[PDB]
């Protein structure tokens, strides 16, 4: 219930020719859009921004307008081992891996946050690789200072 | 009223200047749209198609995307004399003609499908001739093989 309201305020939708292709969540002061997500953001002001691209981290960012910084979601660098939250249910972070039940991620849908139990963004999801009953997630995540994209073998950009 | 399920799955709006011009319908494998109906389909998956066109039949068609074929309506070529289901009221077929109570046919509505008493699409309305209280409809229709167009004189086109 509670974290979904944070997601509903954080998320904005990327449309290609009018068709949903992914999302660009406002995190801190960054509009975190994955680079693989085709098309343009639906918000008329987020479409005005100029984005710093990255092929390595598969990520785009820009300073959000000063109007948006109240709506943008809180982040944290803290990723303790345990239980985390996501739109398609709940996530486990263990062994340094975000992991999810098989098929809970779907093509498109990229750019969803993962939240801690306080509703703070901890990662941006890029895809996942199935391993029996569980999939690991391809994820943008970050330390104190830097992004450190995680991307296991056999992953797909769902 | 059971045909309204099939009609509501078959119909897509055709939009111009921010308003409805008429309607397009999934009939068998083809999307049907009248050629006088200006604008574009609301559905991106249809609006991106390229359409084959005839000025004689006043018709534009394309094979619908394979996933949309689950929603497409069952066509039939058979037209017994009798009642037919439709959105603005019970159509009647008599003497080879489609006819309606005057007023049911409104500006636009072109592309609305007419259904037999089995829920099979049998005609694509285009316009109507004033016949007093019992207007008769200009209609695109098909035999077993090719399409054939019905157009009584004095049709107002809509």
Written as one string, the DSSP assignment of A5-62 is HHHHHH--EEEETTEEEEE-EEETTEEEEESS--SEESSTTTTTS--B--TTTTEEB-
Q: Is B38 on the interface with A (CB under 8 A)?
A: no
Which of A87, A110, A116, A138 is catalytic? The answer is A110
Q: Structure solved using which method?
A: cryo-EM
What whole-number distance in Å separates Cα of residue A101 and Cα of residue A47? Answer: 34
The DSSP symbol for B9 reads H
Q: How far is B45 from chain A (nearest CA, A)?
A: 9
- Chosen for mutation from A17, A42, A107 (greatest number of chain B CBs closer than 10 Å) is A17
A102 DSSP 8-state letter: T
SS3 B45: helix
Do the bridges between strand B121-129 and strand B113-115 make them parallel or antiparallel, or are there none, so unpaired? antiparallel
CA A20 – CA A8 distance, rounded (Å): 16
DSSP B69: G
List A61's β-bridge partners, or say none.
A52
Distances (CA, A) of A148 to A84, A100, A138: 18, 20, 11
Mutation target for B interface from A19, A21, A38, A39: give the one with most B CBs within 10 A.
A19
Here the tokens at position B41 are: 């389909």
Resolution of the experimental structure, in angstroms: 3.1
Provide the 10 A C-beta neighbour count for residue B59. Answer: 22
- Torsion of the alpha carbons at B62, B63, B67 and B73, rounded to the nearest 10: 90
Tell me, what DSSP letter sits at residue A148? -
């Amino acid at each position: 219930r509670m974290c979904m309201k944070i997601e509903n305020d954080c998320i904005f939708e990327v449309k290609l020719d009018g068709k949903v292709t992914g999302y660009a969540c406002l995190v801190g002061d960054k509009v975190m859009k994955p680079a693989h997500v085709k098309g343009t953001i639906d918000n008329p002001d987020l479409a005005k921004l100029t984005y710093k691209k990255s092929s390595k981290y598969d990520l785009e960012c820009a300073q959000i307008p000063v109007h948006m910084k109240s709506d943008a979601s809180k982040y944290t660098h803290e990723k303790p081992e345990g239980h985390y939250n996501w739109h398609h249910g709940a996530v486990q972070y263990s062994g340094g891996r975000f992991t999810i039940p098989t098929g809970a991620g779907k093509p498109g849908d990229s750019g969803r946050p993962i939240f801690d139990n306080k509703g703070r963004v901890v990662a941006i999801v890029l895809g996942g690789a199935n391993e029996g009953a569980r999939t690991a997630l391809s994820v943008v995540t970050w330390t104190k200072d830097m992004v450190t994209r995680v991307t296991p073998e056999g992953t797909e950009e769902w």
